[PDB]
Design a protein around this nucleic acid. Structure first.
Lengths: 92, 78, 104, 97, 99, 84, 107, 94
DNA sequence: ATCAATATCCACCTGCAGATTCTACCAAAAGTGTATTTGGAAACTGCTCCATCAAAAGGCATGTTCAGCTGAATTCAGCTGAACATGCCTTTTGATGGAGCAGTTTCCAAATACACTTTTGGTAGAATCTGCAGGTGGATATTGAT
DNA sequence: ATCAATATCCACCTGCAGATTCTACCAAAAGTGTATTTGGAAACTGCTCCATCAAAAGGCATGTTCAGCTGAATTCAGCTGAACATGCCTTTTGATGGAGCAGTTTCCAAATACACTTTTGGTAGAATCTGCAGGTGGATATTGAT
């Protein structure tokens, strides 16, 4: 049976917009979206480690991969979210 | 079969594309382009089908073929 | 106590890590926090699209986000349009007619 | 009786169709063409209904995008009518040729 | 006479001249200097392998030459012979570099 | 060392003409030279910004021809003949 | 028993062993690589190298020179409909295919 | 010391094979190396994905074969498939 | 522009059905706790190779002039492609029952990864070999004036 | 036409920058032998896919009529190419110092690999409810025309 990000997309929707719902065709687009970006990031991060002769994909590769993939204001805020989630996770 | 893609339909497409006046020769021209497009995409899709030893072209086989032609499509499994 | 909850995210840090292992490479090792960072980012971008899409449905006076809205949110934003040159199925195009074609 | 000047109904169709999102090719003729084409690569094939639907979507996206670029080549040549030489130019700058 | 080649005659010689050769067309030093000005305005105190500056010039010239061919097709299509910035913008839009 | 400014004008009107010659262009309007310089700077920036991102990630201070080669591949302008 | 290189065993000039290793250090995670995947892969790289060198070499003949240069590779690649499509890379040193549109030519 | 692997040996061999009289300049060899590594990556790239889409941990000659049909156009694909099938069968027989 | 009459479009409500959201429990994974394993950090260090400098010379950039011909107006009519009201055929759509065949299983051979102990094939500089860059000079065009 | 006036060839010529071959350790490919999966191979089981039938309702095809667009032709201001004079600043030949890359080690922190214990996320029915697509009737936009 198929994993989907459907659940977690819906959760995120209620945070930013607790009033709005999402149709299923459109929910399928959000899936395609998350998969695509995930594949783009992941791909870039491995390549990065590979160029620098490493074996492990650390958050340093993910962060650089993001600088390379996302266009600019999008890259700032995403890096923010990134370093935010990673510090808080290592405090707790 | 390609001719079953009709003049009115092609007119509709152009309209969405912002087109106001259409030359009479566009209709034959477009069919040929649309046929080269489906030929390239299907060929890849069917290549992905066969490798899977299936007899059924799935929507994933198409999405995959499309992604390869750099014409990524969202809404059918990726 | 789940890592997602620990990291402060809605997105599934654990399933993301297991997705990253089965990527790269043959000796592929995946850091603890890469899963979190990655997850933080999918969630941010998802929030950013859904934000604008919701706006596009409120300004059209409807409760349910459809693919049309997703198309309008994306094409109408310079940064998202740059990052997503996919085809949103059922999305349509931004209405727009060239001046020289308008009837004087 | 009542006639509309040329270009007027045309602009109403543009406005109308840029507003909606349905597929603009008829469903069955399209599917027939897909199967006929696929028959030349493998024989007796079945298609998921959603796979035929992905094709038609990818395909109308494609053609619509290309009509936009074709129209731009046409305006560039100080015309208003698109001609196949506009489609050719557009397809060429794109490196599809 | 004194002898003047008619306008467009030396142009056609140069097209042939340059389509025949393969050496870089931009001067080496001014370009390297431009590459340094741009990297400088991105991250200070940077060095470049010599072949890195060269890889860049190769790619840029490759790029501009390729662009001028597209630009040139837009010009002919507008039934002209002279390329204008209007053509470059059309070539570039269609390639989706600005869309 | 010495301040670097206006180096885009280092790409002379003559160099641009040669490039358009290889492009098979016969007549060039006067406004092209400045248009061209601007296109080139957008191109050069995007590539250099990416190369440098690969440089910083490797904690180096030297942009290598490998960095530029990878940077170009990211943008779909693959270069052959510098890959070492 | 005495060593026989897998390349030899496959009738190839390209290095089956080194290619097998390059393949392992790629994909996926618990990615296994079959014995013959390296052999099949060496055969195509070798075939393609042959197809390009064949065309480049003819170019250098038409130009009365013994040594293949990047120009020659460029002519070979742009000249062949198949290869031009496969290889939309940029050959450093290449140049372009000499070509001028009709409407530019002196009337 | 330190050594980078290349393909120059094998490109040079194949060269003698086709044009026994002809040589290759250094820059030109450098391009052929880029050319080989490029293609190798596209093949392994594609073959990797193919294995993923079919829940298959391993890459076999059968993946590589599909990878090549997807990447090479027309006549190049047909000849490449023969050459590789040939080499594979002769490798298993030997 | 008002004065007409078409026809289009735009808002405001309206009623069900087709989708959405909310509800109910079974496993494939996500979360622990233990015990190795390993990679890529930190620390010296040898040593390419990058930044800088000097200097002289000539290949090119620059700026001017001067006028040829190109682009941009403008006018014209032939005729293509839009609008349309007409006529019917082919798409749509909606159960229906039959079945091909994707997708789970539950096994054993074939194929593959390990883990050591020789055994070459390749690589990095040495040592030799030589195509061809870049210089000359008259055939042979190619242009453009008269 | 047919000469000037220059540009383009195409050949022959020679030492050197750059190839092709010559050696010398080392990483890695190849030989085993043993341990472990894998992805096949039959056998079923549901589930969507194709193939009917059989209508009304679109939506396409067809022929007229003509507005208005494209293309052809004509003219001309002035932009941009060609040529020339001038001299700067790029190129190319060396050397030098030292930054910093890259090759070795030594090894804790961080990652994997079990082996279990819990938890959630995926299904498949249940329970609303959004908005499609359909009225009216009220300005709008369009086109003929005092």
């Amino acid at each position: 049976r198929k994993e989907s990000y459907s659940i977690y997309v819906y959760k995120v929707l209620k945070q930013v917009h607790p009033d709005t719902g999402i149709s299923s065709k459109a929910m399928g687009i959000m899936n395609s979206f998350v998969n695509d970006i995930f594949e783009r990031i992941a791909g870039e991060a491995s390549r990065l480690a590979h160029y620098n002769k490493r074996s492990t994909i650390t958050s340093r590769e993910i962060q650089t991969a993001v600088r390379l993939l996302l266009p600019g204001e999008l890259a700032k805020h995403a890096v923010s979210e990134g370093t935010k989630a990673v510090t808080k996770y290592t405090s707790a | 079969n390609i001719q079953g893609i009709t003049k009115p339909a092609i007119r509709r497409l152009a309209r969405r594309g912002g087109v106001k006046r259409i030359s009479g020769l566009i209709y034959e021209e477009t069919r040929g382009v649309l046929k080269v497009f489906l030929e390239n995409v299907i060929r890849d899709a069917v290549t992905y089908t066969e490798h899977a030893k299936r007899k059924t072209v799935t929507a994933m086989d198409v999405v995959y073929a499309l992604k390869r032609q750099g014409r990524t499509l969202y809404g059918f499994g990726g | 106590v789940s890592r997602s909850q620990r990291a402060g995210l809605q997105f599934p840090v654990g399933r993301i890590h297991r997705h990253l292992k089965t990527r790269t490479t043959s000796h592929g090792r995946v850091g603890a926090t890469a899963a979190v960072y990655s997850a933080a980012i999918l969630e941010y971008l998802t929030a950013e699209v859904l934000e604008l899409a919701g706006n596009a449905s409120k300004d059209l006076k409807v409760k349910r986000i459809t693919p049309r809205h997703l198309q309008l949110a994306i094409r109408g934003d310079e940064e998202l349009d740059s990052l997503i040159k996919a085809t949103i199925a059922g999305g349509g195009v931004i209405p727009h007619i060239h001046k020289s074609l308008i009837g004087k | 009786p009542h006639r509309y000047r040329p270009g007027t109904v045309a602009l109403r169709e543009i406005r109308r169709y840029q507003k909606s999102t349905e597929l603009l090719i008829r469903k069955l003729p399209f599917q027939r063409l897909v199967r006929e084409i696929a028959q030349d690569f493998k024989t007796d094939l079945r298609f998921q209904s959603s796979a035929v639907m992905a094709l038609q979507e990818a395909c109308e996206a494609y053609l619509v995008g290309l009509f936009e670029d074709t129209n731009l080549c046409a305006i560039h040549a100080k015309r208003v009518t698109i001609m196949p030489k506009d489609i050719q130019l557009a397809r060429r700058i794109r490196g599809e040729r």
